[PDB]
Design a binder for this molecule. Structure first.
Ligand SMILES: OC[C@H]1O[C@@H](O[C@H]2[C@H](O)[C@@H](O)[C@H](O[C@H]3[C@H](O)[C@@H](O)[C@H](O)O[C@@H]3CO)O[C@@H]2CO)[C@H](O)[C@@H](O)[C@@H]1O
Ligand SMILES: *[C@@H]1O[C@H](CO)[C@@H](O)[C@H](O)[C@H]1NC(C)=O
Ligand SMILES: [Cl-]
Ligand SMILES: [Cl-]
Ligand SMILES: [Cl-]
Ligand SMILES: [Cl-]
Ligand SMILES: [Cl-]
Ligand SMILES: [Cl-]
Ligand SMILES: [Cu+2]
Length: 235
């Protein structure tokens, strides 16, 4: 159970975005139904009044939290991967529009899942804004918590993989459109019961064995990381 508080751009806090430039749901409950429209941008998908201005090559940092800003972020039990996708705003997230910019699952060196390092990063993880067409976009940040992913929600609705999905409204201003956005995947639709990484037992399978759900990261993606860029406690 975790939500996005806001974003930073090039290490500068853009301020509380909840229901402002983040299409925030009313609480931190997970989405579990892979076929539901809630898979797109969570349970309250509507246009919010602001869109964060960025340029290609900028660092866009999502900041997550549990109950209050810069708290425990997400429960430590929620081991799992993190992804970020992009789609044009005009889609409203519908169709085959979502392009993957970032994926982190398990890091063998450090023996840590993406979620583990998200906590250590005070909720912060980033992508570099790609050289796509200037305009309005949705950035869909997705945490998958696997602590009940031994089961399938479709089979047992009290268990299953848990999705913490947040959509940020981002306006790309300066960009040469040298890497125009390719075809994407639909949400709901891309993840099914047979998809690698949706049904997995973290308690008996080695994490080195884990395969995150496709699609793969777009070759035009410019970078990303799970790491603190800024100190909220000084805000
Ligand atoms: O169900 C057993 C599993 O519980 C996990 O903890 C979650 C609780 O089940 C869940 O009810 C609680 O929801 C809280 C939420 O954290 C809080 O922010 C909000 O204000 O109130 C909700 C209650 O309405 O969330 C926790 C995770 O934070 C354990 O993590 C898991 O190991 C255990 O198996
Ligand atoms: C999952 O979502 C589908 C598509 O909206 C819906 O028809 C179905 O009833 C949902 N499942 C549950 C258990 O609510
Ligand atoms: Cl839970
Ligand atoms: Cl659900
Ligand atoms: Cl860090
Ligand atoms: Cl550019
Ligand atoms: Cl579907
Ligand atoms: Cl980065
Ligand atoms: Cu939770």
């Amino acid at each position: 159970h975790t939500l996005v508080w806001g974003v930073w751009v090039n290490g500068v806090d853009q301020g509380d975005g909840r229901n402002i430039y983040i299409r925030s749901p009313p609480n931190n409950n997970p989405v579990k139904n892979l076929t539901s429209p809630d898979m797109t941008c969570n349970v309250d998908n509507r246009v919010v009044p602001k869109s964060v201005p960025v340029n290609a090559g900028d660092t866009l940092t999502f900041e997550w939290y549990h109950n209050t800003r810069d708290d425990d972020i997400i429960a430590s039990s929620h081991h799992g991967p993190i992804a970020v996708y992009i789609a044009p705003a005009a889609s409203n997230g519908q169709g085959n529009v979502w392009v993957k910019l970032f994926e982190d699952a398990y890091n063998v060196t450090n023996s840590t899942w993406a979620v583990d390092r998200l906590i250590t990063a005070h909720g912060q993880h980033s992508v570099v804004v790609p050289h796509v067409a200037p305009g309005d976009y949705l950035f869909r940040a997705e945490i998958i918590a696997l602590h009940e992913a031994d089961s399938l929600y479709s089979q047992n609705p009290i268990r299953g993989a848990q999705f913490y999905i947040s959509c940020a409204q981002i306006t790309i201003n300066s960009s040469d459109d040298s890497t125009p956005l390719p075809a994407g995947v639909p949400f709901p639709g891309a993840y099914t019961d047979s998809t690698p990484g949706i049904q997995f037992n973290i308690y008996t399978t080695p994490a080195t064995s884990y395969v995150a759900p496709p699609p793969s990261v777009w070759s035009g993606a410019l970078g990303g990381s799970i790491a603190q860029v800024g100190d909220a406690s000084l805000e």
